[PDB]
Amino acid sequence: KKVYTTPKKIKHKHKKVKLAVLSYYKVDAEGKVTKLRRECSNPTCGAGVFLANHKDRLYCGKCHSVYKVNA
Amino acid sequence: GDDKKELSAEKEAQADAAAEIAEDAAEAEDALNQQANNQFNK
Amino acid sequence: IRRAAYGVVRYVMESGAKGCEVVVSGKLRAARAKAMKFADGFLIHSGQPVNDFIDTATRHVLMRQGVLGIKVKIMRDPAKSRTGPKALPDAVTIIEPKEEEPILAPSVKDY
RNA sequence: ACCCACUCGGCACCUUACGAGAAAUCAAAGUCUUUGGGUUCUGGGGGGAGUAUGGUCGCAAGGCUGAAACUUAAAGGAAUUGACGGAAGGGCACCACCAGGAGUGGAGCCUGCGGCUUAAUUUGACUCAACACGGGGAAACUCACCAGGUCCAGACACAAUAAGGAUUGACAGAUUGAGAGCUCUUUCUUGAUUUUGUGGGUGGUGGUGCAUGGCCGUUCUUAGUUGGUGGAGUGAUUUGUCUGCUUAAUUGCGAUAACGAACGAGACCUUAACCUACUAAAUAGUGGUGCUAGCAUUUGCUGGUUAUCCACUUCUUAGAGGGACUAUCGGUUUCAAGCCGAUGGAAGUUUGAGGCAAUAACAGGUCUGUGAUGCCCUUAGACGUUCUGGGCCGCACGCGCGCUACACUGACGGAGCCAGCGAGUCUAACCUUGGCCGAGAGGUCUUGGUAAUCUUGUGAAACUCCGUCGUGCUGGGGAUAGAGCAUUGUAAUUAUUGCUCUUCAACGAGGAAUUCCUAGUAAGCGCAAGUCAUCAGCUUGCGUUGAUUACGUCCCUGCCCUUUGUACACACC
Ligand SMILES: CN[C@@H]1[C@@H](O)[C@@H](O[C@@H]2[C@@H](O)[C@H](O[C@H]3O[C@H]([C@@H](C)O)[C@@H](O)[C@H](O)[C@H]3N)[C@@H](N)C[C@H]2N)OC[C@]1(C)O
Ligand SMILES: [Mg+2]
Ligand SMILES: [Mg+2]
Ligand SMILES: [Mg+2]
Ligand SMILES: [Mg+2]
Ligand SMILES: [Mg+2]
Ligand SMILES: [Mg+2]
Ligand SMILES: [Mg+2]
Ligand SMILES: [Mg+2]
Ligand SMILES: [Mg+2]
Ligand SMILES: [Mg+2]
Ligand SMILES: [Mg+2]
Ligand SMILES: [Mg+2]
Ligand SMILES: [Mg+2]
Ligand SMILES: [Mg+2]
Ligand SMILES: [Mg+2]
Ligand SMILES: [Mg+2]
Ligand SMILES: [Mg+2]
Ligand SMILES: [Mg+2]
Ligand SMILES: [Mg+2]
Ligand SMILES: [Mg+2]
Ligand SMILES: [Mg+2]
Ligand SMILES: [Mg+2]
Ligand SMILES: [Mg+2]
Ligand SMILES: [Mg+2]
Ligand SMILES: [Mg+2]
Ligand SMILES: [Mg+2]
Ligand SMILES: [Mg+2]
Ligand SMILES: [Mg+2]
Ligand SMILES: [Mg+2]
Ligand SMILES: [Mg+2]
Ligand SMILES: [Mg+2]
Ligand SMILES: [Mg+2]
Ligand SMILES: [Mg+2]
Ligand SMILES: [Mg+2]
Ligand SMILES: [Mg+2]
Ligand SMILES: [Mg+2]
Ligand SMILES: [Mg+2]
Ligand SMILES: [Mg+2]
Ligand SMILES: [Mg+2]
Ligand SMILES: [Mg+2]
Ligand SMILES: [Zn+2]
Secondary structure, three states: OOOOOOOOOOOOOOOOOOOOOOOOEEEOOOOEEEOOOOEEEOOOOOOEEEEEEOOOEEEEOOOOOOOOOOO | OOOHHHHHHHHHHHHHHHHHHHHHHHHOOOOOOOOHOOOOOO | HHHHEEEHHHHHHHHOOOOEEEEEEEEEOOOOOOEEEEEEEEEOOOOOOHHHEEEEEEEEEEOOOOOEEEEEEOOOOOOOOOOOOOOOOOOEEEEEEOOOOOOOOOOOOOO
């Protein structure tokens, strides 16, 4: 046939990091628990799901994308 | 196949035809789902 | 090859066919393909009596080496037709007339 | 000299063949394993080789005599069937010619093919039997090519990873042609469905039509193929299957060691021609009668009218029948199958036209129709697939199928006005009458039709008539090009198509060549169907107009058939 070609630089795919992280809640002394990172307002999110914190952005990931709640 | 054996061709072929008549002649004579969702709906 | 084919011919001949034909095409065990006709008895080819009296199939048999064609032709008894013409358009039957015991003295009958 | 008969001895010939032979053949090649008249000589698988060496003869060239080493399984005879001939003899054919028709070949454009070009210009096919072929009219699709971007749709098994997360997704920005979370940034989400590797799969218009099936083309517009019993032969085989005559035909007659038969041709099937009779039709029409319009007429003519009734089946439709068998008569011949002529007839070229189609052949075409297929290739930076955009149309040129023209048997303008085969729409946009808008192209409101019911009498075109042009590259011709307006489609640029003005080329009948054709044919002409969103200079069918000239030959060409030769049989590649 032809047998190869192309400039250089194969592309990579993705990770999903590592993240031991679903520990974001704060317990005071014995035992009271207060939540970090405010949860989400859509009827598809039972407010067990939270909103990512960037800048401007807070965003719902259980909705795979949808919605912009910005506080 | 080769022309040397052609007799044993015709004889075993004759013999294959008799066994289709024997198999033939003998054969002329011879010898819920949704409801389990409803009853489990408790 | 010939065993199976000959045996199929003799079973269809046994079955009261006017005649039958088995064609094997393709390649058996050798590089170069071949074709073998196996016929017995009476068959016809041209014309509408084909459409009435002969059923043909072809079948692709797919083997470790390759693919063989099998085209089986069977000519049923026309006299047994039971729906269709009962003979070939070729058939012409005269009726065997009689031996006459000749003449008489003329006379007459009365009733 | 000649004739006839006879007889020795000759050169030959003819027929047999009792006999012999592997056979072709042979009065010897016979008088044979029933093996013996006399005698001379030669040969003992094929090569090496008539070579080496010695002897001998020769002026010489060469003669006579004449080994071996080594090598090899066939070489050789006669005959058979095939096959093949730059051999002959017969036949057949408008894919051959004669007599002619219209052309093609020239020109412009249309198209395919080569070539060049190109990131790419995807690829098959190359005499007839490649080149308006792959149903191949490609804007994306198609699509196989090229420039880039995504996705797994990587079954299943084992391993490993891993609930402290195997893995999935994504907003904004970045990025990207792109409102692709491709990838990055950021940090939520998901929950054992994946991920990683091995093994194994899967897909591939990737390869091989020279591994195959299936199909198809071609030999073949052909006429050939086989077997029973009997004859010939040791045999394979042969006769049958043939000189002649006849046919479209191994179609028949006839000749006959053959007789009597089978596949193929024929028959058969479909379709077109004819049925004052069969059975019927508001989904076909006819006459009558009402209702009624217009002319003129004391009447009569022409329309109109989905039922207003009554009758009928000529014309239209399709069931089942019938009819042609070359019939009758006369010619002509083997005194034959046939052939020519006449009359009749719907029809007498197998009535016209087709479908089907024996044995075999080909390295014909096709893995680019197939979830037909072997093997090879590839399979995650994919040859899988999708998306974006180009390409298949690219232009010094060579070739093939065509379309349009060179005009006065015409163009243009009125006017006349006639077909046949077709096809059409429910999750849908098909065929479209009518009504208005528009120079057009088209637009728009309605409508009939799943259809002998509506479009549709598809009011097609050539053609007919009355005029304008008047032989002037002209009012013939319309390539090229500009500007504008519409239609299909997401998308019209390299201009899908359509329309109006303008632009107004070559072409003054086409060299060497070469195609097709015999009667409702050739030729002119349009239509529908296929492709199909749009696009036909293409194809498949259809009807409209409708001739000249053959009713022969074997000169050319092509093929079939005898014979003939062969050392070919993997068959003249
Ligand atoms: C004017 N625009 C178009 C016009 O060009 C024409 O187009 C048709 C086209 O649609 C047809 O398309 C075809 O498609 C169907 C379908 C079943 O495949 C066919 O049955 C039928 O031949 C035809 N209707 C084509 N065959 C002919 C053109 N004149 O007619 C339809 C139209 C929409 O009016
Ligand atoms: Mg084959
Ligand atoms: Mg026939
Ligand atoms: Mg003499
Ligand atoms: Mg020797
Ligand atoms: Mg031909
Ligand atoms: Mg020619
Ligand atoms: Mg001529
Ligand atoms: Mg030309
Ligand atoms: Mg090209
Ligand atoms: Mg062609
Ligand atoms: Mg092309
Ligand atoms: Mg593409
Ligand atoms: Mg591909
Ligand atoms: Mg794997
Ligand atoms: Mg081939
Ligand atoms: Mg064929
Ligand atoms: Mg015999
Ligand atoms: Mg026959
Ligand atoms: Mg009336
Ligand atoms: Mg009638
Ligand atoms: Mg006569
Ligand atoms: Mg080839
Ligand atoms: Mg195929
Ligand atoms: Mg393949
Ligand atoms: Mg394939
Ligand atoms: Mg193709
Ligand atoms: Mg290919
Ligand atoms: Mg296909
Ligand atoms: Mg198949
Ligand atoms: Mg060419
Ligand atoms: Mg062609
Ligand atoms: Mg006119
Ligand atoms: Mg009608
Ligand atoms: Mg009509
Ligand atoms: Mg002019
Ligand atoms: Mg003009
Ligand atoms: Mg197009
Ligand atoms: Mg075409
Ligand atoms: Mg003649
Ligand atoms: Mg040669
Ligand atoms: Zn949300």
